[PDB]
Amino acid sequence: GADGVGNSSGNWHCDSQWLGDRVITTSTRTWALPTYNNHLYKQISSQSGASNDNHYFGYSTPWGYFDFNRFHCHFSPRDWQRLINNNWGFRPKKLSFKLFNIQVKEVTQNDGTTTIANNLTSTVQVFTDSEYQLPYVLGSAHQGCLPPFPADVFMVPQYGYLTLNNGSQAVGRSSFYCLEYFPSQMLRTGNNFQFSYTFEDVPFHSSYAHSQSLDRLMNPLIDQYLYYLNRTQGTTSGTTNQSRLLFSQAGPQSMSLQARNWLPGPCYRQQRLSKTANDNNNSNFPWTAASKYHLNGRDSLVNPGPAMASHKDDEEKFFPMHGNLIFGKEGTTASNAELDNVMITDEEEIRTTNPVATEQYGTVANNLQSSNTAPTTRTVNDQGALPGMVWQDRDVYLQGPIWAKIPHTDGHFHPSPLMGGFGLKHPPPQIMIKNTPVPANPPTTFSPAKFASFITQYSTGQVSVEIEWELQKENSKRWNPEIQYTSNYNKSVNVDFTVDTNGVYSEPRPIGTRYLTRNL
Amino acid sequence: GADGVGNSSGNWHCDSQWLGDRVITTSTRTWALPTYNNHLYKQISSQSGASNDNHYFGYSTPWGYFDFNRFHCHFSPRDWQRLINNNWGFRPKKLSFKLFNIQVKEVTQNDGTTTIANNLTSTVQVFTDSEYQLPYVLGSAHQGCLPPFPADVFMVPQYGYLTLNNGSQAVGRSSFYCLEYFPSQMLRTGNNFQFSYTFEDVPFHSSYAHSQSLDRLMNPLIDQYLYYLNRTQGTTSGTTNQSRLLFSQAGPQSMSLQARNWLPGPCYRQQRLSKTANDNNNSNFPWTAASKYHLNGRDSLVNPGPAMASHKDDEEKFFPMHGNLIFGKEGTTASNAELDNVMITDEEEIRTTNPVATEQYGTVANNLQSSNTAPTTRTVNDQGALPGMVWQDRDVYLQGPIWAKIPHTDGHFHPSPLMGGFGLKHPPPQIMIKNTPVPANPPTTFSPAKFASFITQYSTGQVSVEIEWELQKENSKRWNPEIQYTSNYNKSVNVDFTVDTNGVYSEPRPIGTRYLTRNL
Amino acid sequence: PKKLSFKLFNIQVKEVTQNDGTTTIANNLTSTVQVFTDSEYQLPYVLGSAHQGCLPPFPADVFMVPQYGYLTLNNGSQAVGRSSFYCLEYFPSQMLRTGNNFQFSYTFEDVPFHSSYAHSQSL
Ligand SMILES: Nc1ncnc2c1ncn2[C@H]1C[C@H](O)[C@@H](COP(=O)(O)O)O1
């Protein structure tokens, strides 16, 4: 693709249409790119004795990058509703990436006024980490994605990565990556950038909730043919009746004693919190009493753990200590914001396959009972994996992460990103972008010294992203209507998912995905 | 179709599947048929001086008939939800009718016990009024349709019709119809009946609500270029300023004064009622104060009138005196039942095209104002049809009527059935059914007298009805989610649209159709 | 009416700066503009309401292009749940630089001739 100055290098493709078996979303946004790090690679690390479990070492690059690992980058609210309310599941298929209508602007502070002018001969550099040789910094819920609202212009994030570290120091096996050591396409105004990607085979997401329960699985009307022991001593308690071994045949009556075929999913107990700031202990325990793990003598918070339900029946006020994902409302400090300023996600559809996050797991025996010894019971707060266990995964939300790169290790278990979504061995590659350095006035005499005098300039253009989604259609013989997402028909102030009096788009609530029901 | 005794003449086809562009519903039920009128055609009429506006004359036939002019005959609740929440509109296309697995039983009261036995050699008679030579008695919301619940067995309705009448007497131009004078197929056990029908071109129903309003149609930001007169006297009211003619250019400000292009629909004011039995007048006025019409000196209640909205904004408690359709809950006297026993339908989606039923229509002038005469205003309570008028039609409900035969007259206006649905010149024909008379013991001596001694017997079998529906797909660029029908996720007593403790199916609420939104 | 041909061309994008007390206006050659047509009528039709901003009766007159706004469903100053929000960035649109242009053709439907006459008789 090569055209002229007064000729656009692309069009605005922002649309979505459905094919009953699949859906194609196209999304275009306007982007702006500054000059990060002053065209310099800078070594970064932790403050000399500021914190210990936060010690780190890495580098900062003059490169920006494109991100669209959020669902609202592609699905308008209305669309998300069509998807959510009609499909057993869904997944990604293809991807088309396009950069175009590029403009390079250089600015000058002459006196007390900034003039901005065109630098037509200036270039910009783009490339894609398709061999995954660069540290994958996406799928970490960072900021700088495409604006949920198409009319919103966004700033392109800067690229930085972390390496291996011993405290604030580094090791010998630490890796330094130069992005100038990658072949990249240079673009002038009227040039453009093309890219296509094909997702791998990754299971459909669960856009459903089970209409049965792991324990309420059998026939309510018939008794089993298996027997269990329910009386160890209790007999005809009158004369000469100390103890006896008695067995009962399973019945719809003994519903939680019947022989079973499957187990609930794994668990890692979280601490229970209440939204009412007075049910809780008068202490500050978000760290000393929260669940966590430690690698190399460094404690890390187990924020979203295994998929566990948020609360039990008849509660809805108790949420796991960070046992779920939380989104911040529009306009809310990054530092200690009120509970009325954030949006907490309820995972109450998986109550049927998974243990509750705050509750125990079950009961294990740990002794050899006899006439001499009384049988001991121990509450299990942590459960690894077991043959027979089944479970559901974390939901995805309109503004949640989509995919995540699966770490290249010797072993994985259930490679589904813990924050939710699609785990990929080879995910959509990273798209790097940066303004090419333009030297200012050079000396008539030759100076070997590092060149530091540059013309200040930023870039702007459009970006387009087209993704094809495969849908799993609903096939239910449920007679009664199912629950659907819907807006309040009530006379309301502002309209949900809209701009306000002074033009600011805002998403009212987090949107789940499990509205339709399937059987176990 | 001709088979044997020990061989079924058909299968149970009760299913529905979607084709994205259309939907096919198949419905099978078990039916029973008695011997109506004792195999006799009886002349019926009004009680000698019982009532005047209810005077009538007609006949009663020994024939039964099949009816499925209700939506719940075909759509399960879940299906209705899929249709309602996804489609701009819909309509009927084809029809397949089948009678099979017929059994004729004859009963005898010997002493004090009734024995029921098989009459294998007995027949039954079926035919279809395809030339519409018989009075069309369907589309009048009668009872005896197919049970909403497939497991429910139903009794087949008896056929009767009305003719022309002068009070309780009849005229010379009155018509007597014998159904034995129609060619009909006679069926033994193992015989069956086949029938196929194709609907005519009838507009899609409105499964949508307008997102704009007839009066809020223009640009909020720009002023018109047309001028109106808004001041007749009011001027610089100080000295020597009695009156003057002043004109203002239309603005977003003068929003209800701007020149217009269209009118709201027609109207026929209904009386306003409140659900709170104490806001109302302490009188009994459901007849003396309700809207009605009269043909041939006979007052008839204008029950569902032209499509008019039920209530204005911020009310929802005032419903038009019978200005809408009302469904009776499961198990509720046909005679004076409480308000908590019926289900009233709210027509509040057509607020944007239609006048309110209880409110006035508008304002008309009726004098020649001058300095001598003060300008008079008259409130218009009744409005015929006008060039420029636009409107919406009555909604259809899961348990509402589907179609209605359009009377064969010289003139029609908007041939949409007033109770709602599809008006057809040539609707699905009537399917008559009756047990063939079986004479009992005859005298060894010849008697000319009318034969009256018959063997008592009834019939039973299955009936199947397959209808193909064309769908109009949703194509909206609405950004925010639309309102959808959904069930209460709340911990509930009984499940909506279900059988209860003693097996009785019950529909909780009337279901509209206008959930999705389209522009004007 | 029968047919229609629409064309946009000779486009110029100007950017202005208030530096001190004087406004300088200069060419932004690399700047674009976005055009599209609501051919599926998915956007509220705001024409045919006698608004202003049409083409000048006199060809020599230059005109300012009107701004787009629409009304939805409302209960007083408040809105309802069935109210519709339309984003025009969610429509595929052609982007034009200087030297690009826009083409469009339309065919009217069968609509009766207007009455350019008066009856010489009376009912
Ligand atoms: N997001 C995602 N990506 C890939 N696989 C998933 C995912 N979620 C669940 N699984 C399941 C599907 C396979 O049966 C299994 C492969 O594990 P393996 O370790 O590859 O043998 O992991």
Ligand SMILES: Nc1ncnc2c1ncn2[C@H]1C[C@H](O)[C@@H](COP(=O)(O)O)O1
């Ligand atoms: N249910 C139904 N059936 C038929 N036509 C309908 C119906 N609802 C609205 N209309 C409209 C469609 C045609 O433009 C018009 C024909 O009227 P005519 O009197 O036939 O010239 O009536």
